[PDB]
């Protein structure tokens, strides 16, 4: 059983704090600790044991045990397992000690739980509203199961935005350069405040969650089990198969569900095919701010032949719908599989020539070095997970630590650079394109065979687990608890860029105005995945 050593270390460091512990799967572990001793346990597992704060979230278990539940998912990466730290916040006085003064990665999860559930982490410095809009009435906490109906819409208190932006390094003489929410080539709402002195950015604050639909509440009220796979696809058009596989594996880990052999690694094939689509889009956007546009339209061309295998492996463009809880909906056939193999190869042909642009190295040496540097010291604290943390030096990858859809039968390579520039994050994505093309080269020629679907099973109530996938921008951790045979009790999703966002203040600092859209797009944000 994985995770015994960390539990023993927690027991010897803290003798009588672990009130209860249980195993979800072999590599999944949860512990219930004391409420007043919570920040020491998570800080210990974070700093001393080398754990990364993946996701933390609240729960409404007042009719299950009479208490709120705040979970703290930690990824052990020094074998490698999942540890969740659970606390039982009191009902009529919801207050638990905060982790943000100890672990900086707990700054927005503890701001989200102030809004969705109304729980109060005492000692949290950033007390501003995060997810709910500025016109939201105060005490309506949406994710409380008895606060309001999902269909209720309060009257907007204000038409103007009342958000407060902090200026850490600037003063009352600095000007601001908005870059949202309605900006061209941003293609997605998100506000930015560049506190500039000239063209240099002194400080940078931002307002997000303009695309907060509220699908966490809607996934547990109006919508079932097989239908949330459609909700996960319609979050963003480019992580659709990442969210669906992350949600599906959360529900199949919550029960047994011994999925058939080829239905695992076909999901591994389509997970990598999607990162051909998303990385080559970012590399096209990397050339549209570096300068050349005949490097963009051409990355659009190699993106189209990545869309051509996505046309034949599924038959759809963007949002799809190919996974169910037991297995995959539509199934690949022989010629599709022989064909995808050399269109993978001709892309490796085309990708090599198009990557000869950085070999050219003129705006790819002066515009993309020393710009938007992310400190690996900072990236370790805030627990970034995408190509950000792989460029900064940490070999953080879900497919190597935790093979979820049969990646152990596929050739896995983790690429980590040393520089922390924009050009370093492009080199992460360039080596990931060849890596994903090696898996398409080695996946579709040796399928194990067998069935595709496992259905007819009954959902055991109040069973939960963690589901994870390797999205193109990092990992998405999906935690879902089964409610009954039809509905979910609670489904929580954290986007790949949700962990990535709180370090944009430390990238845009010291840079210029002109390359500031390049710094934001260097990590390839998916606002719709993080805004939920």
């Amino acid at each position: 059983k994985l995770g015994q050593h960390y539990l023993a270390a927690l027991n010897e460091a803290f003798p009588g704090v672990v009130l209860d512990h249980a195993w979800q799967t072999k590599d999944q572990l949860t512990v219930t600790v004391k409420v007043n001793y919570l920040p020491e346990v998570v800080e210990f597992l974070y700093y001393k044991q080398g754990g990364w704060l993946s996701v933390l979230f609240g729960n409404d278990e007042r009719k299950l045990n009479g208490h709120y539940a705040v979970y703290y998912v930690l990824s052990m990466e020094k074998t490698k397992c999942w540890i969740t730290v659970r606390v039982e916040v009191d009902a009529n006085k919801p207050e638990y000690p905060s982790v943000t003064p100890r672990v900086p990665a707990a700054v927005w999860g503890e701001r989200e739980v102030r809004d969705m559930y109304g729980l109060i982490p005492v000692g949290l410095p950033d007390e501003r509203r995060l997810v709910l809009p500025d016109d939201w009435p105060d005490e309506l906490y949406p994710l409380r199961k008895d606060s309001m109906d999902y269909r209720q819409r309060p009257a907007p208190t204000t038409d103007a935005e009342t958000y407060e932006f902090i200026n850490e390094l600037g003063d009352k003489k600095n000007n601001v350069v908005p870059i949202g929410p309605l900006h061209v080539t941003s293609d997605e709402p998100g506000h930015f405040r560049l506190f500039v002195d000239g063209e240099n950015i002194i400080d940078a604050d931002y307002r997000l969650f303009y695309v907060h639909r509220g699908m966490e509440k809607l996934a547990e009220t109006r919508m079932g089990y097989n239908e949330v796979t459609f909700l996960s696809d319609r979050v963003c058009g480019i992580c659709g198969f990442a969210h669906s596989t992350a949600y599906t594996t959360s529900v199949e880990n919550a029960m047994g569900i011994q999925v058939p052999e080829r239905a695992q690694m076909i999901r591994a094939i389509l997970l990598e095919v999607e990162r051909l689509h998303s990385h080559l889009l970012n590399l096209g956007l990397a050339c549209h701010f570096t300068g050349f546009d005949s490097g963009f339209m051409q990355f659009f061309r190699v993106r189209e032949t990545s869309m051509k295998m996505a046309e034949i492996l599924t038959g759809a463009r963007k949002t799809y719908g190919l996974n169910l809880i037991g297995g995959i909906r539509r199934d690949l056939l022989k010629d599709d599989m022989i064909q995808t193999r050399q269109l993978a190869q001709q892309m490796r042909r085309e990708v090599q020539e198009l990557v000869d642009v950085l070999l050219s190295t003129p705006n790819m040496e002066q515009r993309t070095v020393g710009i938007g540097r992310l400190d690996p010291e900072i990236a370790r604290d805030f627990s970034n997970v995408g190509p950000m943390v792989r460029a900064s030096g940490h070999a953080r990858d879900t497919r190597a630590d935790h093979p979820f859809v049969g990646y152990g039968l596929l050739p896995m390579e983790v690429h980590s650079e040393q520089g922390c520039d924009v050009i370093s994050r492009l080199k992460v994505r360039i080596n990931e394109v060849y890596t994903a093309l090696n898996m398409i080269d080695y996946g579709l020629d040796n399928l194990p065979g067998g069935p595709l679907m496992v259905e007819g099973f009954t959902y055991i109530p109040h069973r939960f687990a963690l589901g994870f996938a390797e999205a193109p921008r990092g990992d998405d951790i999906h935690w879902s608890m089964t409610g009954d045979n039809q509905k979910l009790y609670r489904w929580r999703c954290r986007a790949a860029t949700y962990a990535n966002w709180p370090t944009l203040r430390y990238m845009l600092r010291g840079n210029t105005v002109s390359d500031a859209p390049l710094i934001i797009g260097s990590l390839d944000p998916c606002y719709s995945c993080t805004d939920r």
Binding site: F230, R234, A316
Partner: protein
């Protein structure tokens, strides 16, 4: 993966497709005035997932090869049908779609139910009144 069209000659009024629609593009309401069930499809809600053609008992709703769907007014999105409800033969409360009951009777005649339609009074009886029949 084009527009869902419904064949009204083959829809039996079983909210199967309505229950499987994630975006509630398909809606049914029971109109006691007219004794009819108002089946409706809205293209302004449809996310083109294809669950409706998956769960249709009689394959009436299909997604065609039609992708040119822009309109000037919102009411052109709607596909509407009305099916006469079947009144009970013990009480007279409307309990099911008459076309659905006739389709069920046709299904039972095929696999071998020689006297299916001579038992039509059992099929056009509400399940509450059918439970009172076996009590006596």
């Amino acid at each position: 993966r084009g527009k869902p069209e419904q064949n009204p000659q083959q829809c039996i009024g079983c909210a199967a497709c309505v229950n499987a629609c994630p975006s509630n593009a398909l809606t049914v309401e029971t109109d006691l005035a007219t004794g009819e069930l108002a089946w409706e499809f809205n293209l302004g809600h449809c996310i083109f997932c294809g669950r409706c053609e998956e769960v249709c008992p009689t394959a009436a709703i299909k997604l065609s090869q039609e992708y040119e769907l822009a309109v000037w007014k919102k009411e052109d999105f709607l596909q509407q049908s009305r099916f006469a409800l079947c009144n009970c033969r013990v009480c007279n409360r409307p309990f099911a779609v008459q076309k659905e009951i006739d389709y069920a009777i046709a299904l039972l005649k095929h696999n071998g139910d020689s006297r299916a339609e001579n038992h039509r009074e059992s099929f056009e009886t509400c399940p509450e009144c059918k439970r009172q029949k076996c009590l006596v």
